[PDB]
Structure formats: C-alpha cells, structure tokens
Structure 1
Amino acid sequence: AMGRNVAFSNMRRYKCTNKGPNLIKNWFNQPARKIRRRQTRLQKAKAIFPCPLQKLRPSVTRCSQKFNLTQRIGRGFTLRELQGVGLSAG
C-alpha cells in the first residue's frame, strides 16, 4: 500500500485532462446505440425484404498455430471455389 511490497504501476500519466483533444470516451450512449443500430438493421431488412441482411461468406481456418484447428467467416469466396460450384464472380 504505502510503499513496502507493491507492484509498480504500468498506468500512463493522464494527458490533455485540462485542455486539448478530448481523451475521455463515455459510454452513457451505449444503451441508446443498441436501439439505433437495431433500427438501421430493421429499415434495411424492410428495404430488401426477401433478401437476407448478411451475404454468404467463406469458412476460413483462423490464422496462427494457436487457432489453426478452428474455422471462422472470411471476406469472400475465392474464384477457384466459385469455379467449382460453376458460378461467376458477378
């Protein structure tokens, strides 16, 4: 506590507290953000009713030795994968 056996802090000293760029984010907007993002999704869903909101994305092995076995969604299907299903990019 007061010295004695303590672990030294890795806390960086506060910057621009008195003046300058606002370096304090506040999350009072977090409950309202969920509603706003939901409203945007609901309006987009209505705009293209039969079309699903998310595009089909490929299964990708997660990168690195640590996550090698596991799979995740990636950006898009390769042209070779879309040559096997017989499709074209467009």
Structure 2
Amino acid sequence: GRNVAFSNMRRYKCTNKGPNLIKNWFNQPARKIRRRQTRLQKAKAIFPCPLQKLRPSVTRCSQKFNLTQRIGRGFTLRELQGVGLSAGKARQIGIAVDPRRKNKSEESVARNVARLKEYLSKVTIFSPEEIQQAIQHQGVVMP
C-alpha cells in the first residue's frame, strides 16, 4: 500500500463473454501494406490525375491553435469567385468545394483565393503520349 496515487483505471468489462473488446494491433504491418496497394491501384485508375485533391487553407479552430493553418473540407463559393469558377467546374479541376463553409473574414477569402489561383496555374488539362508522361501529384496538393 503506502503512498500510491489512486488507480484511475476502469475494471475490465466483458472480459471472457459477450462483446470482444480486446483488439490487439497484430496487423499494423499488414494494414499498411494493404492500404499501399489500394492507394497505388487508385493512382493507376487516373495516371495524370492526383490521388488526393486541393483542400482549402483554414485557420486551426480555438484560441490555442488559432495562429496556424490546416487543410480543410472545401473552398467556399465566395473564394471560388476569385478563380471565377462554378462549383461543378471546380470538381472537374480537382478543387473540393465546401458550399457550407463561410469565410468569416475578408482576409480568409484572400489566402484561399491565392491557393485556388495556384492550382489553376499548376494544373494541365487533357481531353496520348502527354498523358503517358504527365507525372501525377504524389502527396496532399500544396501542403
């Protein structure tokens, strides 16, 4: 006994019966191999196209992290006026669109409008050899 800080553990539940609540991670190497092949098959399905898509630059939520920026669900319609594109066109060029997102600042529109402009400048669009030698983006676009 003596000066032991009190245990905060929870007594084991359904140990030998009912729900299987022990889920050992013995497949961690295996899962990583499975995900890699699936990602590689997706990349092959559109060789010129990137596996992932351009995501908006958003300020991290809450005061503790509200001075750095993280990738988010999509660009708002006001941020799409900056690149002059409709929502459907944005999907065609790989821009994900969050129509729900509201910029909440005029400054927010500008960092996003710049990000949208770069994708449109960097992208090359093809509707034979060029597609074969295109080289797709590997990684999150412009992290």
TM-score normalised by L of structure 2: 0.61
Cα distance in 2, alignment partners of residues 42 and 84 from structure 1: 34
Quote the residue 1:13 is aligned against: 11
Tell me the SS of whatever aligns to 1:37: helix
Instruction: Kindly report structure 1 stretches of 4+ aligned residues shifted beyond 4 Å.
Output: none
Structure 1 residue 85: deviation in Å? Answer: 1.0
C-alpha deviations, 1:30-77, integer Å up to 9, x for none?
100000000000000000100001111000000000001000000000
The two structures, once aligned, show a CA RMSD in angstroms of 0.5
Quote the residue 2:26 is aligned against: 28
Cα distance in 2, alignment partners of residues 84 and 47 from structure 1: 31
Unpaired runs of 5+ residues, structure 2, are: 89-143
Cα distance in 2, alignment partners of residues 4 and 19 from structure 1: 35
% identical equivalent positions:
100
**Which residue, out of 80, 95, 101, partners 1:82?**
80
Structure 1 residue 10: deviation in Å? Answer: 0.4
Cα distance in 2, alignment partners of residues 85 and 12 from structure 1: 54
Structure showing greater radius of gyration is 1
TM-score normalised by L of structure 1: 0.96
Structure 1 residue 19: deviation in Å? Answer: 0.3
- Aligned pair count? 88
Cα distance in 2, alignment partners of residues 56 and 5 from structure 1: 55
Tell me the SS of whatever aligns to 2:70: strand
Tell me the SS of whatever aligns to 2:84: coil
Tell me the SS of whatever aligns to 1:80: helix
